[PDB]
Design a protein around this nucleic acid. Structure first.
Lengths: 111, 52
DNA sequence: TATAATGGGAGCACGGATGC
């Protein structure tokens, strides 16, 4: 279904705040923003899609994403907050794309 | 409004009540589409705390 | 790199293994 202005703004907000939360987690963990992002995304999408990312220095497999997920869940409450923010951020990204999929058709039909 | 405590002092044929009263005064806030509510239902807030 | 835009377009024949 198409997004109401409120819904659109909400999802966009969750996305932006999500990216910010990934940056924050990069600050705290001392880890790579890319690696963390890929892990969060992997957990949101599930084990269905797991693959090596060209930019990552480490091959991404269930083992590695599990270790990183556990190193994320081993944070204090106020730090662990940003993990939830990030998760819901990725989910919101997914829904935003899936909702705006029609615009692409309406534009592409002219090309 | 409810009366928590009631003190009574008699003068002449009349009584004077010093009442300790507690009540709640409502205030409405209009939320525009670009605003988001950061507070749950029935939550308790203080002075300075962000609502929307 | 920012007004808003959100669901396409076109276009005869007989024989034989299968599938409901």
């Amino acid at each position: 279904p198409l997004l109401t202005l409120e819904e659109e703004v909400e999802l966009a907000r969750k996305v932006e705040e999500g990216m910010e939360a990934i940056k924050k987690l990069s600050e705290i963990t001392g880890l790579d923003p890319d690696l963390i992002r890929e892990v969060v995304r992997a957990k949101i999408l599930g084990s269905a899609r797991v693959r090596h990312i060209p930019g990552l220095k480490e091959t991404l497999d269930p083992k590695t994403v599990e270790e990183i997920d556990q190193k994320l869940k081993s944070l204090p409450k106020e730090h662990k907050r940003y993990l939830h923010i990030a998760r819901e951020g990725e989910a919101a990204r997914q829904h935003l794309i899936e909702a705006n999929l029609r615009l692409v058709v309406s534009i592409a039909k002219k090309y | 409004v409810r009366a928590a405590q009631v003190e009574a002092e008699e003068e002449g044929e009349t009584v004077y009540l010093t009442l300790f009263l507690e009540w709640t005064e409502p205030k409405d806030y209009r939320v525009q589409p670009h605003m988001n509510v950061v507070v749950p239902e029935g939550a308790r807030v203080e002075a300075g705390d962000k609502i929307v």
